[PDB]
């Protein structure tokens, strides 16, 4: 049981670090929370429910992301329908789902069908054990906005398709929550480069 508790503590710490990197106004107390303090605040049992929380963007309070932890593994269509109904009721456009096992193909099709209305991100528990961003091999990644993307396109007089491509399934894109059509800035240890998400 204690192994599961420390696993969940590591997952929560990595999730908070990723949210802080993405800029969702994460409090310093959560980032600097120790294992002993987390266990003391945990109580007797977590039941994968206390990890559910809602976070809003630092720049704009209108945008918010809800983190959902299913009670049991191998979720089905009913659980996804309940989650999307809850999102519609709460009026949230983004959500992060952390699951223990791979999703049902029917659940994946349901997520893809409703991807236009709301954006859903799925992360495995094993993938969140180690923070990908905090690595020596991974260089600094900076997400460019629409104005900066337009300035970059106009400066080199190039099209969006005539840029180096990065797949959505890459861990960095999912870590930064990058959608299709967004460019990034990479600084190597100096010469810089840009990658187009496709």
Partner DNA sequence: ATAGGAGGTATTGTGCTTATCGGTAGA
Partner DNA sequence: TCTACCGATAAGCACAACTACCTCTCCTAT
* Contacts with DNA, residue ranges (CB under 7 A): 74, 76-78, 104-107, 109
Q: Are strands 165-166 and 140-143 parallel, antiparallel or unpaired?
A: unpaired
36 binds another protein (CB under 8 A): no
154 binds another protein (CB under 8 A): no
107 binds, among another protein, DNA, none (CB under 5 to 8 A by kind): DNA
134 binds another protein (CB under 8 A): yes
Q: Which of 8, 65, 172, 178 binds another protein (CB under 8 A)?
A: 172
Cβ(96)–Cβ(127) below 8 Å: no
Dihedral sign for Cα atoms in the order 25, 29, 34, 40: negative
CB of 170 to another protein, least distance (A): 6
Measured CA distances, 177 to 19, 50, 81, 180 (Å):
10, 23, 22, 10
Contacts within 8 Å (CB) and 24+ apart, 57-62:
57/23, 57/24, 57/25, 58/23, 58/24, 58/25, 59/23
CB of 126 to another protein, least distance (A): 5
129 binds another protein (CB under 8 A): yes
Residues that bind another protein (CB under 8 A): 3, 6-7, 10, 124, 126-127, 129-130, 132, 134-139, 156-158, 161-167, 169-172, 186, 188, 191-195, 198
């Amino acid at each position: 049981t204690e192994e599961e508790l420390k696993r969940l503590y590591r997952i929560q710490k990595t999730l908070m670090q990723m949210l802080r990197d993405r800029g969702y106004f994460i409090a310093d107390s959560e980032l600097t929370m120790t294992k002993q303090q987390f266990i003391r605040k945990h109580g007797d049992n977590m039941k994968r429910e206390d990890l559910v929380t809602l976070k809003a963007k630092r720049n704009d309070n209108s945008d918010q992301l809800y983190i959902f932890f299913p009670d049991e593994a191998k979720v089905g269509v009913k659980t996804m329908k309940m989650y999307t109904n809850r999102m519609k009721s709460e009026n949230v456009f983004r959500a992060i789902l952390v699951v223990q096992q791979n999703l049902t193909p029917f659940a994946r099709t349901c997520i893809s069908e409703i991807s236009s209305k709301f954006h859903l991100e799925v992360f495995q528990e094993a993938e969140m054990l180690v923070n990908i961003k905090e690595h020596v091999l991974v260089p600094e990644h900076q997400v460019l906005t629409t104005e900066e993307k337009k300035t970059l396109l106009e400066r080199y007089t190039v099209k969006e398709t005539q840029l180096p491509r990065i797949q959505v399934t890459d861990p960095i894109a999912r870590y930064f929550g990058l959608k299709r059509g967004q460019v990034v800035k990479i600084i190597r240890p100096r010469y810089v480069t840009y990658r187009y998400v496709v």
